[PDB]
Amino acid sequence: EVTDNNGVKTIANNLTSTVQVFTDSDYQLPYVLGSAHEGCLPPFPADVFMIPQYGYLTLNDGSQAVGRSSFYCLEYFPSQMLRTGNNFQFSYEFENVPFHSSYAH
């Protein structure tokens, strides 16, 4: 918890607050990975990174929406709640992809 008293930043930890996590495992959210976005885990293990903000685009008539435009409340999914003693584990099996050709002819 960060507090601002007279322009002074004091950071205290809030032991009872939670963080919500879920994996969109049924693929029912717009998928924004796969657009080559600058928000990833840093190449160097000793770096600390900010988590990028999630957002999506739907059908637009210029700047306007249309009837087919879909809105997603992410709080409508079941999430896991974590307060500082909790951890989150996720396992995934890749589908059968071909080997990437790591050679020249």
């Binding site: 029912q28 717009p30 087919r68 435009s69 809105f71 997603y72 409340c73 409508y76």
Partner: protein
């Protein structure tokens, strides 16, 4: 996939061919080798029934928004759409397609 729409099949439902069996009128009393072009005029009538089982894919959207649906209109008219008129002739008002629900790409 057929260009006019539908399900393309190597082995579609087989053609059903039907014919009235020719009934010769009456042959001459002396023999003739020609192929008896005189016939009794007749036609057949019957009932035909077709039963098709269709497998369905139920819509499973997490969309919060109400969707576009095919509907009839609640406005006074001379005839009911998709009914018969005073003459007794059945007519179909417009061509109804199958794309009203929505999915993400």
């Amino acid at each position: 996939s057929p260009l006019m729409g539908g399900f393309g099949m190597k082995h579609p439902p087989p053609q059903i061919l039907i014919k009235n069996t020719p009934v010769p009128a009456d042959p001459p009393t002396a023999f003739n080798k020609d192929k008896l072009n005189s016939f009794i005029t007749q036609y057949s009538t019957g009932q035909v029934s077709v039963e098709i089982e269709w497998e369905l894919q139920k819509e499973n959207s997490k969309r919060w928004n109400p969707e576009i649906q095919y509907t009839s209109n609640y406005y006074k008219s001379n005839n009911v759409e998709f009914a018969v008129n005073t003459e007794g002739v059945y007519s179909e008002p417009r061509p109804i397609g199958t794309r009203y629900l929505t999915r993400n790409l």
